[PDB]
Amino acid sequence: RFIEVADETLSFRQVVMEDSTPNGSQISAASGFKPDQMPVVLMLLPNGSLEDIRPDEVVDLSSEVRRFIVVESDRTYFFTIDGARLEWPCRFITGYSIRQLGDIGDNKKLLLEREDEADLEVQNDQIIDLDGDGIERFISRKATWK
Amino acid sequence: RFIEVADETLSFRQVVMEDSTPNGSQISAASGFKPDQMPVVLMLLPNGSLEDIRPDEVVDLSSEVRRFIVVESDRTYFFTIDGARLEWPCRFITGYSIRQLGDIGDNKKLLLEREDEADLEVQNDQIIDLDGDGIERFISRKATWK
Amino acid sequence: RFIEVADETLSFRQVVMEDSTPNGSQISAASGFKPDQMPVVLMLLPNGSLEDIRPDEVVDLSSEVRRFIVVESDRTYFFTIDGARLEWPCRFITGYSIRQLGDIGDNKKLLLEREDEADLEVQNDQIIDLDGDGIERFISRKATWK
Amino acid sequence: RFIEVADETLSFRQVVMEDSTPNGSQISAASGFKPDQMPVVLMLLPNGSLEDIRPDEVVDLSSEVRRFIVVESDRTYFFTIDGARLEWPCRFITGYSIRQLGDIGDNKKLLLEREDEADLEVQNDQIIDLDGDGIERFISRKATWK
Ligand SMILES: [Ca+2]
Ligand SMILES: [Ca+2]
Ligand SMILES: [Ca+2]
Ligand SMILES: [Ca+2]
Ligand SMILES: [Ca+2]
Ligand SMILES: [Ca+2]
Ligand SMILES: [Ca+2]
Ligand SMILES: [Ca+2]
Ligand SMILES: [Ca+2]
Ligand SMILES: [Ca+2]
Ligand SMILES: [Ca+2]
Ligand SMILES: [Ca+2]
Ligand SMILES: [Ca+2]
Ligand SMILES: [Ca+2]
């Protein structure tokens, strides 16, 4: 078997799986993490959501080549893209990572929802801090500027 | 159908479910949360683990009366009890909550693992901050004092 | 049987129903509307949603005293309060009507979501035009001003 | 499970449903719509009527392969065919769409009711604007011309 494993840089690499039905611990071990590190493993669902894989949660790999994000972290932050919830192990996320996670086309404009002022436009290299209180909400609009 | 829903106080209450296979959004709505709030929903597994329920993750309730923790939060912290990983939407957790989550008997002593000094004993009303870097590790030992 | 029937003013009045399971046509007729007028009938659900009642859709009134909004109109506009969708037969809606529909407490502030500028605060007597393109989104926050 | 989903073009396509009792949100998501878009979902009843499905209204799909019209819109217009009320998310509707919705045979003539002049005959490609005040009424007669 083969899986694709990435990190906060979202650069997937081939990892050999000897078990067709591994749990989170086996996926973490195959990615190069010791059992004590216990990294956060997020499986990419076909629809677009991210499913958290527990260290004892068995995943069936016989379906297709599934993708995982394995990042050594002790917490996860929740944000939303067009109302769809997504999970990120780090507190700082770039606009490029948001576009990759949300599968937002390059012909659209990414915005951060605000209430006290106009929605903030997020560039590819702009960094958004997820540690702020509340769930950060992101929006995709047509690439038009007034 | 009926489910039991609790919060950071871990006081479960009866909630009526009209759908036998609801997703996270339906469970949140039945608990009294508006769709924009998007609370964190954690299902209590029979073995003892906590499974995060996405807003679009369908849960089969026909098995038995399942228990959920529905807490309005934007993040989750990971800790461990005897090597078993657990998830908590809040950054401050009491020893009583840790005992309830880990099903630790009252005849055992709860400790917080440390490396630069002796492991810290956690009382029932003592508050542990999960916001510290790294995964906090908790240990259950025999109730003996030297 | 008895039902409560209101209009765009949301002033409910007692209406006598001779059938325990009437359809939309019977409810419209009992409210004083001729069959050719065919008014829009919206039943108030216990959770807070509004259910459109077709002229041939049977409603079971044996449960409790249900409430209806019967307004002679040829169209309905969709808006949202805290992510919950609501339906309104008129294109102009006041903030008081929005608070009544959403059951928003008087200790909270009502806002209209915007993208090119700060979210607009909606007063009780302020009129919002639902005829604008897109679904209008309303938000309830704590009554604090900077 | 499988459902058929169409749009204003009334060209139904197969959509896979993983839940036998989904709500409007799940049907919209399976059709390719983000949660923030919140499209209008209209279920085709066996008798011929169109039932509006709220984002939190559960639909039982175990009966048969049901058909839905999922159109991203913020409003719905009401018209009538032979006194039967129908709902349309768009303001412009062609005669072909009216015939498809009303199940009018090709051997009949479609007319638009008028009061100040003779009833207007509607061709297959003729466009009727539903935005006009009042409920537009359509009539099916024998295909005879004087
Ligand atoms: Ca295995
Ligand atoms: Ca999981
Ligand atoms: Ca805004
Ligand atoms: Ca946050
Ligand atoms: Ca999950
Ligand atoms: Ca130690
Ligand atoms: Ca920690
Ligand atoms: Ca009856
Ligand atoms: Ca209905
Ligand atoms: Ca509108
Ligand atoms: Ca269901
Ligand atoms: Ca409905
Ligand atoms: Ca006429
Ligand atoms: Ca009209």
Side-chain angles (χ1 to χ4, degrees), chain D residues 16-131:
Chain D
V16 181
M17 292 302 305
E18 301 180 2
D19 189 9
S20 59
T21 59
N23 53 18
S25 299
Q26 297 182 240
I27 299 178
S28 302
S31 304
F33 291 91
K34 293 300 178 299
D36 248 6
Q37 305 189 217
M38 195 174 301
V40 179
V41 179
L42 303 174
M43 182 176 60
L44 273 158
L45 297 183
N47 58 85
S49 301
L50 287 168
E51 168 64 26
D52 198 332
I53 304 301
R54 308 185 315 272
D56 59 327
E57 179 178 359
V58 181
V59 179
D60 190 7
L61 297 181
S62 60
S63 178
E64 203 68 23
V65 179
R66 295 186 176 182
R67 289 187 165 188
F68 301 89
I69 303 174
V70 183
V71 176
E72 180 182 4
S73 180
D74 73 321
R75 69 191 66 180
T76 54
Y77 296 90
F78 299 107
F79 60 97
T80 53
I81 303 182
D82 295 80
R85 198 190 74 177
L86 291 181
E87 196 173 356
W88 193 245
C90 302
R91 58 173 297 182
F92 298 108
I93 183 169
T94 58
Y96 180 84
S97 300
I98 300 172
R99 291 181 175 270
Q100 292 296 330
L101 290 179
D103 197 68
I104 301 179
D106 55 76
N107 66 276
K108 284 190 174 183
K109 177 198 304 178
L110 185 62
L111 301 167
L112 176 64
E113 292 196 31
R114 287 175 166 179
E115 302 178 7
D116 297 326
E117 49 186 359
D119 297 6
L120 176 66
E121 180 180 352
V122 181
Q123 306 296 335
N124 293 90
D125 59 328
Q126 184 174 348
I127 299 180
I128 303 299
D129 185 11
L130 297 180
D131 192 73

Side-chain angles (χ1 to χ4, degrees), chain C residues 36 51 54 75 131 137, chain D residues 36 51 54 75 137:
Chain C
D36 248 6
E51 168 64 26
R54 308 185 315 272
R75 69 191 66 180
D131 192 73
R137 299 188 172 272
Chain D
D36 248 6
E51 168 64 26
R54 308 185 315 272
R75 69 191 66 180
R137 299 188 172 272

Side-chain angles (χ1 to χ4, degrees), chain B residues 100-120:
Chain B
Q100 292 296 330
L101 290 179
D103 197 68
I104 301 179
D106 55 76
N107 66 276
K108 284 190 174 183
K109 177 198 304 178
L110 185 62
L111 301 167
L112 176 64
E113 292 196 31
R114 287 175 166 179
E115 302 178 7
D116 297 326
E117 49 186 359
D119 297 6
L120 176 66

